[PDB]
Amino acid sequence: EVETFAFQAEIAQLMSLIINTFYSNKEIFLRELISNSSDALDKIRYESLTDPSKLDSGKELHINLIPNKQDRTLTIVDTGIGMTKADLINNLGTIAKSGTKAFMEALQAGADISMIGQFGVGFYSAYLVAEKVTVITKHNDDEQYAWESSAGGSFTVRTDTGEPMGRGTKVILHLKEDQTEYLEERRIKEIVKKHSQFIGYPITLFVE
Numbered sequence: 674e675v676e677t678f679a680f681q682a683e684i685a686q687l688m689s690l691i692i693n694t695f696y697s698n699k700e701i702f703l704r705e706l707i708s709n710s711s712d713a714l715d716k717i718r719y720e721s722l723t724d725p726s727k728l729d730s731g732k733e734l735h736i737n738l739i740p741n742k743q744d745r746t747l748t749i750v751d752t753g754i755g756m757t758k759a760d761l762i763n764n765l766g767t768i769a770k771s772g773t774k775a776f777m778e779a780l781q782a783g784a785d786i787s788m789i790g791q792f793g794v795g796f797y798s799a800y801l802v803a804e805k806v807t808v809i810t811k812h813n814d815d816e817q818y819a820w821e822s823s824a825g826g827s828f829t830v831r832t833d834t835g836e837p838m839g840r841g842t843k844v845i846l847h848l849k850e851d852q853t854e855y856l857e858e859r860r861i862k863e864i865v866k867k868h869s870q871f872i873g874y875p876i877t878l879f880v881e
């Protein structure tokens with residue numbers, strides 16, 4: 674069963690801006706997604722200090738970057754806190770609305786798209802390089818969900834019946850046809866070294 678939802682107008686506008694604005698520095702999407710994973714790993718780690726059973730779903734805290742040229746996907750996998758259905762449908766949109774407003778105001782004052790993470794909406798930078806984004810996520814006391822959007826004003830959520838993850842999030846970037854450089858080992862390594870070199874969890878770049 675697949676549920677279809679409308680983005681808030683402000684978030685649809687942000688996604689359109691990211692898709693339509695001419696901006697060549699697209700590589701910053703990876704820093705934003707790795708930062709989000711690092712934050713999620715920080716969160717499960719700190720919560721586990723007062724409730725160690727929150728790691729029953731997996732003790733290892735890490736990030737995997739998995740390119741697949743057959744599928745034309747780049748996947749960012751973490752074993753962080755994960756997201757609930759309530760996050761996916763309601764709560765993330767609440768903070769994304771205020772963050773988008775501040776980001777738009779900063780852009781009008783001369784800021785550039787690379788500062789998007791300062792406004793809490795860095796996830797949507799995925800649409801600099803992806804025509805579709807699928808997010809598989811599992812939070813401790815909730816089901817495994819698949820979120821998906823090709824923009825256009827809507828997203829879907831369904832219960833995921835794929836390989837169980839234990840706990841964490843996979844962001845699957847279905848790359849635009851002209852953005853396949855982000856499947857190349859040398860290019861991904863270059864970007865991680867430039868923008869994500871002090872992340873406090875192992876980042877494993879898979880090879881194909």
Ligand SMILES: *[SH](=O)(O)c1cccc(CNCCCn2c(Sc3cc4c(cc3I)OCO4)nc3c(N)ncnc32)c1
Binds near residue numbers: 820
């Ligand atoms: S906690 O609950 O005290 C707490 C403290 C501070 C902040 C938060 C809220 N964190 C939300 C993180 C969401 N998120 C992201 S970004 C993101 C992902 C997706 C959408 C929108 C956004 I904005 O729509 C679909 O997916 N990336 C995350 C990862 N990798 N893991 C967990 N949470 C993530 C809570």
